[PDB]
Amino acid sequence: ERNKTQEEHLKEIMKHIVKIEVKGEEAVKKEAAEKLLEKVPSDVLEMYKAIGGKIYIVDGDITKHISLEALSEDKKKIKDIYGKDALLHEHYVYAKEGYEPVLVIQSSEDYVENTEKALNVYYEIGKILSRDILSKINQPYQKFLDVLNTIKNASDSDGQDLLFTNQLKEHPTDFSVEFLEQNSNEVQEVFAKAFAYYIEPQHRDVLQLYAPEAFNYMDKFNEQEINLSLEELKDQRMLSRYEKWEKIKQHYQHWSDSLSEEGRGLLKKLQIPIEPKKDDIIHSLSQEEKELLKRIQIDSSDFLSTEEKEFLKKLQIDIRDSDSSNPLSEKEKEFLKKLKLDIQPYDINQRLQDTGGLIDSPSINLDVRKQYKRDIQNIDALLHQSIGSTLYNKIYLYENMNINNLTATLGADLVDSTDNTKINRGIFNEFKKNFKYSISSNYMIVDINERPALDNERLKWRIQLSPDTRAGYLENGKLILQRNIGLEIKDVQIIKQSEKEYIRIDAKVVPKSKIDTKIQEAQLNINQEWNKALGLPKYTKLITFNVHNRYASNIVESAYLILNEWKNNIQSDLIKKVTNYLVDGNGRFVFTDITLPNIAEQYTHQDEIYEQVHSKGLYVPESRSILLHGPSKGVELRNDSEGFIHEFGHAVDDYAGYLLDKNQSDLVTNSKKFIDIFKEEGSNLTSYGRTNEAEFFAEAFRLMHSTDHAERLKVQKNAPKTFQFINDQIKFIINS
Amino acid sequence: ERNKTQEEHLKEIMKHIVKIEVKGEEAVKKEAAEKLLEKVPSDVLEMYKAIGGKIYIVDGDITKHISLEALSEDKKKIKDIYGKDALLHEHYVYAKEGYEPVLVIQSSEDYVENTEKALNVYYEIGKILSRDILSKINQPYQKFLDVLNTIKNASDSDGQDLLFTNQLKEHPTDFSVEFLEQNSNEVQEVFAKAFAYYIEPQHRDVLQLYAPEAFNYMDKFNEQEINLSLEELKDQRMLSRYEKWEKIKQHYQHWSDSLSEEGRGLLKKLQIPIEPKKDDIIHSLSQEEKELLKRIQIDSSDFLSTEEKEFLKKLQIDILSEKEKEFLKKLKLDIQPYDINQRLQDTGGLIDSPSINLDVRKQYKRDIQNIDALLHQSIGSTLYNKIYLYENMNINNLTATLGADLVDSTDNTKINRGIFNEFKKNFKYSISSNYMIVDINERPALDNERLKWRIQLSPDTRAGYLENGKLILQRNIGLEIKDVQIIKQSEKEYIRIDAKVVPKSKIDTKIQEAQLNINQEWNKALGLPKYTKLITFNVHNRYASNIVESAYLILNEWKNNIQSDLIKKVTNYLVDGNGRFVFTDITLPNIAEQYTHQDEIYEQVHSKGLYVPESRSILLHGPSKGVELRNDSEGFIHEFGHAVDDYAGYLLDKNQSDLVTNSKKFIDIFKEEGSNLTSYGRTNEAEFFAEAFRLMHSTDHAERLKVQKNAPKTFQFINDQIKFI
Ligand SMILES: [Zn+2]
Ligand SMILES: [Zn+2]
């Protein structure tokens, strides 16, 4: 496996692509070339072979070779690695472009000593890689460009002088992808030079010495990432995609034939959720509920989505076929909540994702909960065959994904807007910033060979499977993977496919346990930091990470950022007193990526199951806890920090009310004073703030403590009574 | 000439994929196989070669060949064409499936005589075609399925007996895409079978005799359509795609190297329109103009669009139904994106059209004239023969009315067959008035693009090359539609449109001949002078032929639903003023029957229909979907109502006024029932009158009845207006 058939592998390449055509007794001229091309990564050679390339070793005038006999007069006029002019007629190395490419090297042993001839041979091979190979997969692209711009803007211009031509050195601005399209040859050459300097033993130090970023790029590219280029090149071939599909299918052939009718049915419903049937819902209703339904104003609730409203309005019809007055009635609201739970589609995977694998979570009705549990355990037993095989060295599988599943907040500004084919770099950098690990609580459905995405899928995952990863095969060339998978993010970059930009995410499957311990360590670390900063007792448990999904590491890292803003925009004493009040009731700041109805701080204090809430944030008085959902996008918010501060507004509301006396079980916003203030300025801030006194107060609080001081002024010039009311409470708390 | 590159070509294939491994009579054996493989369309052999397939002619037990050495015992059990079992070690042919497909044939000299064995070999090759080749491009699919269904539902069950197994005959319903997905072996089998009976000369008559549809399908497939199969197969290959791209790149190399900065700039903005800048618009108001904008009910007028409301509403945060809504009409012209291709599509190529301000009109003309000169080099080259280019298109660009129901309401990966057949019915020719931007090699479509064009260029077609593998073709392109079918790609269904480029003059001639033909028909049916010009086809865009053919259908429904004498009277009046029934695919503000009579440019109106009193003409824009009306027939009848409103008024004072609806003696009637019908009619008396008129002559009698019990006065009033005769 290692250098075992690895050395057997490289010898297979030289076999087919290297033709030793000389007259000076081929024996020493061959070994020489072998030692020459040996410094080149084996994958570069395998990609060349895949591109139909051929390496010809011949003596004499190379321009007289069968392959080069057709070159245009202008092509015989060339330049060397240093930019010096020369003629092919009297040169020793040439890489012929065209889609029947060839690399002609003039036989010689000077390569061992003459490091200037070697350097040039590698420069030409670098041209092959950059111009003839990587172009077939839209590379180099943004990643390499960043390297060029890092040099072009570096302080010590030594890197610029070592690799940039005068044209590049003189470009007035950073090199954009536009520049790359119209000056491909220039980018291609800078690449080849760097590659050459890295491959040639003696010059490598020269590269790392004057072009650090170029050295880092080439070091990581040749030692690691180049295997991915080969994989991606193979993924573009009709016959290689088909061969790979056939071998995976054959590997799961016994498993596929052993599937029962029940097994097959389980995989199908997993892939295709079951919509609720109109009739089944109706017969489950009581006469009183049927009457309540057929007369309820559906399009007036805020607890129902469009699909749901449409579904209900249809049921409303089936029943029928057999300024004031706008809000739902007393029990119409309760009825709709209860109805909401019954109309959700039966979706195995969605159940796992919402619960993060906690399938016993009492967020749904016991009967449905039990059926989900049954299918899950049955699917797990079904997926027992690991991917490991004697047919593939490394296995990569693909997944097109909607960025909104990870962060709907960044998803809103990811696509340019002026040109849909492009991604905004600022949002991209923010997305990538703290993305180191990911978790799949549900069963990932993946493609054997990469396929085209839908408009809303701008994420393209390339996943390296573990040989121990268990999975099942699907006839449409897909695999269903076992639940509870850990993923290490190796690289995140902007790429181009079919003339459209996407975010490539390279990930490696690892044991989920490895990722859970990282989460656990962070939870302990963030508490030690804040217990100290807030002056809370040592060992105090305030912050909880309930993390189980695909953007895991970001949920964790953003919490530090969220609390930093919180402390920066709010008065220390207000933060201490309110927080100490929460801690006195064993409360928690909960950061999670599973839906809120599945967080104990909420569900253990609910009377009925349907009395559940899922949103960006939530403050639960009974448990004195703040819950913040990461992946969702809050209304009128542009940050999770704003969402958190909004909820802290509610806690401040609670504590101020509490300080009023030994009873009240309400909010300071429930005061006759604030109510009147609300009736007056209630609609001068955000629309969401007009919902009720509680929400108006929270919104006012949020805006008054915005990182943007302008937003804070707005509250004073639009809601003067409120601006003063809030500051009155803060002082009331601080002075207490 | 023809066989100059055919015979020598086929021999190159035989050379690569045909290995003769026999005793020593390697001359007669080899020649026999050649005669055998001869009957097969050359393209199948080339496609087999493309997927790595090999053909071996051997002696004795075929299973003893190296290629079938690893064959599992189970696969050694085969069923011949007739469904009878057989043992490979006793058989003469076998096609091994797999990433390294192989075909093994036992050498014989009596294949011409022993037709049943020849039939079996062709059957195995037919299996390679459906199972190993076509499956790589998602075929067979809907087109073939129709053939199957036409066979199982034909009067005589002859065809079934000849080509269907029991699994197929026992099917209770028609074969759906779902059945084909879970019975691929069965479908692939019937295909191979049909293929075989067609290829074996002696068996061709039997096929044609008991299974006509199958014969026709295979006849048209092996004689021409297969060429497209090869083309699509090649379009899957990385190296084939890049080789085609490179030849085209080479052909345009001098053109590309000679491009200036200005030239490149034009090609750029042609691809990406320039949205209006706020700072630019605001600075053009300043004084009272800003004041007016300051406090206006934006989301009120129906003259603006959603995208246009936001921009305007945004102009307010950066600083009505009277003469101020007039201010919005003017502003609407100033906020459009600078989009060259849209301007050409809206005007149908008439760039002098006075539909936008002079400053912008001139800017567009200069850019267009400059682009026309840049694209001077035609694709014709010595580096390649027939070139196909590709284009993904939003169906709403052709017909937004069908486009609303094209995609299955539940499963968006599926196409509604009913709308498909409607869309395809009269789609025979198309015209491009703007610059088509096509892909050298086919690429994936966006969500709202379900049409996939495969266009055969003409060596004379002029184009510009782009670095991203696309070509910008010259404007004024003519296209003949060769085939339209439903296909599957990447788990989604699409509409494949095979079109061939021809001189635009050739298409304009078809439209011109149709205009004379339709006027001859209605001049006779309406009793008008022999050569009057009533109906005009102002056709310039991609759904050209449908605009023309639906005109006949629209007028037939117009006649069949309205009193012959009301029609005759009103039209004679329109002709008296030299009016027209204008069926078009360019926007209304660019017709003439409208713009020559506008007092101001901003007073222009674009919509599904329009009636202009001054020119006595009815204008009907095909491509769009009526914001109210359900179809074009209704759209027309609605406008006719306006014509009636015009004539009736004329018959009350042939020297003053014009509309009976404008009479104060009707306004009141509008005060009562005006809100008792469609919300469109609720707009005003003219629209109400037009709407009421439409309903009364509807094809749905129910509709007719409603106006009776919902608008008893109007129903009696209108019937009194038609009285004027
Ligand atoms: Zn709130
Ligand atoms: Zn009208």
UniProtKB/Swiss-Prot annotation, chain A:
Result of mutating residue 16 to A?
Impaired translocation into host cytoplasm
Q: What is its EC number?
A: 3.4.24.83
**Keyword terms of this UniProt record:** Host cytoplasm, Hydrolase, Metal-binding, Metalloprotease, Plasmid, Protease, Repeat, Secreted, Signal, Toxin, Virulence, Zinc
* Chain positions covered by the region annotation IIA: 237-271
Query: What residues form the catalytic site here?
Result: 647 (proton acceptor)
Q: Please give the annotated consequence of changing residue 17 to A.
A: Does not affect translocation into host cytoplasm
CDD domains hit by this protein? M34_ATLF_C-like, M34_PABD
Region entry IV: which residue ranges? Answer: 512-736
Pfam families named among the record's database cross-references: Anthrax-tox_M, ATLF
Q: Where is this region: III?
A: 277-343
Q: Where in the cell is it found?
A: Secreted; Host cytoplasm, Host cytosol
Extent of the sequence repeats: 256-274, 283-298, 301-319, 326-343
Region feature 5 X approximate repeats, mapped onto this chain: 256-343
Q: What is known of its domains?
A: Lethal factor (LF) is composed of four domains: domain I contains the first ATLF domain that binds the membrane-translocating component protective antigen (PA); domains II, III and IV together create a long deep groove that holds the 16-residue N-terminal tail of MAPKK before cleavage. Domain IV contains the catalytic center.
Q: What does this protein do?
A: Lethal factor (LF), which constitutes one of the three proteins composing the anthrax toxin, is able to trigger rapid cell death in macrophages. Acts as a protease that cleaves the N-terminal of most dual specificity mitogen-activated protein kinase kinases (MAPKKs or MAP2Ks) (except for MAP2K5): cleavage invariably occurs within the N-terminal proline-rich region preceding the kinase domain, thus disrupting a sequence involved in directing specific protein-protein interactions necessary for the assembly of signaling complexes.
The molecule here is called Lethal factor
Swiss-Prot record, chain B:
Name of the gene encoding the protein in the UniProt record: lef
From which organism does this entry originate?
Bacillus anthracis
The record's SUPFAM superfamilies line, in alphabetical order, gives: ADP-ribosylation, Metalloproteases ('zincins'), catalytic domain
Briefly describe its induction.
Answer: Positively transcriptionally regulated by AtxA, which, in turn, is induced by bicarbonate and high temperatures (37 degrees Celsius).
**What is the name attached to this protein's record?**
Lethal factor
The residue intervals holding the sequence repeats read: 256-274, 283-298, 301-319, 320-335
Function summary = Lethal factor (LF), which constitutes one of the three proteins composing the anthrax toxin, is able to trigger rapid cell death in macrophages. Acts as a protease that cleaves the N-terminal of most dual specificity mitogen-activated protein kinase kinases (MAPKKs or MAP2Ks) (except for MAP2K5): cleavage invariably occurs within the N-terminal proline-rich region preceding the kinase domain, thus disrupting a sequence involved in directing specific protein-protein interactions necessary for the assembly of signaling complexes.
- Which InterPro entries does the record associate with it? Anthrax_LF_cen, Anthrax_toxin_lethal/edema, Anthrax_toxin_lethal/edema_N/C, ATLF-like_dom, MetalloPept_cat_dom_sf
The yes or no answer to whether the keyword Protease is present is yes
